[PDB]
Amino acid sequence: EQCGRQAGGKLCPNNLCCSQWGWCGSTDEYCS
Ligand SMILES: CC(=O)N[C@@H]1[C@@H](O)[C@H](O[C@@H]2O[C@H](CO)[C@@H](O[C@@H]3O[C@H](CO)[C@@H](O)[C@H](O)[C@H]3NC(C)=O)[C@H](O)[C@H]2NC(C)=O)[C@@H](CO)O[C@H]1O
């Protein structure tokens, strides 16, 4: 994926959250 464990620990741009599955968001599905 793009971020988190399923990307090997990358983070997200500007200010957004990173989903439990590993993608960027800033919404609950992507902060939880
Ligand atoms: C309950 C569960 O975990 N079921 C498994 C599936 O989740 C898994 O596929 C993954 O699904 C998620 C959710 O649809 C995918 O995330 C989304 O991926 C798109 C890719 O275009 C991304 O743009 C979205 O932002 C992102 N959403 C979120 C909330 O992060 C994820 O990429 C899938 N990963 C993979 C490697 O397939 C399937 C396998 O396909 O298995 C289920 O057991």
Curated annotation (Swiss-Prot):
Residues 1-32 form the Chitin-binding type-1 domain. Disulfide bonds join C3-C18, C12-C24, C17-C31. This is Hevein. The chain holds residues 18 to 49 of 204 of the full protein.
